[PDB]
Amino acid sequence: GASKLRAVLEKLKLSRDDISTAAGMVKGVVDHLLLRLKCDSAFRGVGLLNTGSYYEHVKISAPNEFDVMFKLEVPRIQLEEYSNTRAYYFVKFKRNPKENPLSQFLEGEILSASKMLSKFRKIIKEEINDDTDVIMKRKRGGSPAVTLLISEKISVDITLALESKSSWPASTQEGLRIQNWLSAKVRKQLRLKPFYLVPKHAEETWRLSFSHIEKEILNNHGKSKTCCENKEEKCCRKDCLKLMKYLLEQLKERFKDKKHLDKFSSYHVKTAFFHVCTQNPQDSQWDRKDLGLCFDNCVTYFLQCLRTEKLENYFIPEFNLFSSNLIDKRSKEFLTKQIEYERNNEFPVFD
Numbered sequence: 001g002a003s004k005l006r007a008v009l010e011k012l013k014l015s016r017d018d019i020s021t022a023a024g025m026v027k028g029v030v031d032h033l034l035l036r037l038k039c040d041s042a043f044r045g046v047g048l049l050n051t052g053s054y055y056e057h058v059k060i061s062a063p064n065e066f067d068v069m070f071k072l073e074v075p076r077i078q079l080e081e082y083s084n085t086r087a088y089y090f091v092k093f094k095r096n097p098k099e100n101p102l103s104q105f106l107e108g109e110i111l112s113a114s115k116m117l118s119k120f121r122k123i124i125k126e127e128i129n130d131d132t133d134v135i136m137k138r139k140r141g142g143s144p145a146v147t148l149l150i151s152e153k154i155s156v157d158i159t160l161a162l163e164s165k166s167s168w169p170a171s172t173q174e175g176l177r178i179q180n181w182l183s184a185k186v187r188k189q190l191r192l193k194p195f196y197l198v199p200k201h202a203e204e205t206w207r208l209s210f211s212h213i214e215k216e217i218l219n220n221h222g223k224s225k226t227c228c229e230n231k232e233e234k235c236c237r238k239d240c241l242k243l244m245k246y247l248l249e250q251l252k253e254r255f256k257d258k259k260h261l262d263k264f265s266s267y268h269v270k271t272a273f274f275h276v277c278t279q280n281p282q283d284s285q286w287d288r289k290d291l292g293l294c295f296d297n298c299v300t301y302f303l304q305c306l307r308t309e310k311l312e313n314y315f316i317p318e319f320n321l322f323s324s325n326l327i328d329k330r331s332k333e334f335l336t337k338q339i340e341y342e343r344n345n346e347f348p349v350f351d
């Protein structure tokens with residue numbers, strides 16, 4: 001009973017892969033900012049998080065909204081957990097040449113995020129005009145730090161991130177519970193990769209970012225090493241993630257006039273999806289023939305998290321994404337009812 005879901009997926013895939021000049025405009029704008037930022041005193045080591053991440057799309061229904069991350073390496077960094085929040089940190093410096101590039105943003109021993117953004121934004125804001133109609137926005141703030149608009153259609157969220165090649169902070173030690181699915185060998189390898197810090201609040205605090213580990217898992221997602229390398233070992237994991245993402249997006253669109261869904265994002269959906277991967281580690285539990293059932297397991301688990309108001313961060317297990325101080329009871333109950341409506345009516349949002 002997959003026929004409608006496949007067609008949704010087919011429609012979505014054709015609009016992703018269709019010939020477009022968007023990635024080209026985005027890349028020339030970004031190479032522009034990278035040259036300009038590289039000449040400034042604080043941003044001399046700035047670089048793209050991934051060569052080829054010009055075409056990173058958070059919104060899976062909008063192929064002209066691009067998501068771009070700029071990375072800056074902070075060697076010998078001192079993290080201090082903020083207010084037992086497990087996920088938010090002050091950045092301090094071990095300062096060996098106490099005039100490290102970032103020192104001009106120090107207030108006390110503490111790295112200021114808002115000051116760093118002000119100059120990042122100001123450098124970008126002036127570099128914007130000296131080709132194309134690149135407009136920016138001081139909207140929202142935080143992360144995304146800067147949203148550019150190329151012409152009318154194309155939109156580029158730029159996020160600035162600190163990179164640390166030391167071992168991941170102690171709040172991750174019992175997370176990424178992939179041992180029964182991707183193996184303990186692979187968990188070790190992943191935790192040997194650097195971690196990233198972006199600004200956000202719940203003061204001058206930073207938050208862990210793991211989009212690179214997510215990408216890595218999704219590009220090597222099977223218990224079997226040959227998963228999805230032919231169509232005989234073809235699994236529906238990635239397609240379920242797509243259908244989860246698209247369902248929230250269409251509900252966020254349908255109900256934008258109200259407000260109850262403003263706090264949910266694809267991060268809540270990704271997180272719940274990887275928990276289901278842990279719960280179902282076998283590739284035979286993700287057979288393409290069973291797309292319909294497999295999607296339904298994801299939708300069932302997410303609804304269970306909403307109803308119990310528990311969805312543990314996949315990397316930091318003491319952090320509850322659905323805690324009532326983060327999203328109130330009336331918002332989860334609202335999203336609970338819309339998803340149950342969709343499931344019981346063979347998903348009208350997919351039309």
Ligand SMILES: Cn1nc(-c2cccc(CNC(=O)c3cc(Br)ccc3O)c2)cc1C(=O)O
Pocket residue numbers: 087207208209210211212214263265266267270271274313314315
């Ligand atoms: C509302 N909100 N809160 C966060 C957030 C808060 C604390 C800690 C992390 C840690 N990060 C992850 O758990 C993570 C997981 C996956 Br899977 C992929 C990338 C990731 O960074 C994220 C992100 C968003 C949002 O984006 O709206």
Ligand SMILES: [Zn+2]
Pocket residue numbers: 221222227228233234235236237
């Ligand atoms: Zn697969």
